[PDB]
Amino acid sequence: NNLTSIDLSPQTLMAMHISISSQALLNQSYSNLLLSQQLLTSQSMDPGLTVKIKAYQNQLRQQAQVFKQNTVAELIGLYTKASNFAALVNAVNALYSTEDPQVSQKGAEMVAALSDVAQHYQAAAQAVHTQLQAKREMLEPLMGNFLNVIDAIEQGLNAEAKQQAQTIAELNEAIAKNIQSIADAGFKAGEGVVQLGQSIVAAVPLASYMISGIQAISAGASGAQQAVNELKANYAKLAVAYRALATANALLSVAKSVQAQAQLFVDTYVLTEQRMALLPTEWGKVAEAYLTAAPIINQAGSAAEIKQAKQIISLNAEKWQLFSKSIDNAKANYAGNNILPEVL
């Protein structure tokens, strides 16, 4: 109705871009893990299962490469649009720093213009989300069929081997939680520099399929020290379980190691897609607010009404600059987290 009711703020955009970065950065590291993982050779012995494992491994590696190189760039592109918008709000602020007597009209047209820009960023986000949802609809059936392959083999295992399979599944779920604790401590809700590494954590004899796993960098300064000690303990026990299950069915151990790497990639893809689902609607809310504000900013034309508009605009400009720094940080993480360095 009047100046006090307009919302020129970034609304939930800052928190949403942090929650997106949270999962997308981790999924960047899981992509590098799938790409670093030694390929299974045609050891044969059981060529049927080997083809099925290699097929899934190759299809996952191809999807990890598409996320690492294409999807990340597409997200960095969305974040750049948020930076751009922040600059435009800061331009509206720069306008009000002049003693133009017709500032109310020039200001209202600029806000009405940003309204249209927000509507475009809405469409830009919707495009990325459609791409993410399309792949998600392909990755779930792919993983589901591979899980049917594993389960079909497991129903025919002896008592001891079926238990080594349960133990592997349990530790893979435990190690996931450990990695999540470690990454969240490094991320500090968008203020930190998320950095994870990798190493050979286990091996299955055939001559030797060597399984890669995520590790913390700086086993001394990474927030959640509890999680690092659990991770080392869990990897040690995981290595035993694989060597054990391998005496019964070696390629089953390989298959479970591949599925564990996939579970992390597909689960974090799905979370990245669900955090992204809300972004179009939010840009839409910014577009709707800016459109409504325009006529109100125009009516504020008295010396005092202008001073009050300048005040509101300057406050929302500072809010957008704080979000613009949150974006620069996220963009620097995506850049620096492109490499998954080795650890000993």
From TrEMBL:
Ca(2+) binds at N337. Keywords: Calcium, Metal-binding. GO terms for molecular function: metal ion binding. It comes from the Bacteria. This is HBL/NHE enterotoxin family protein.
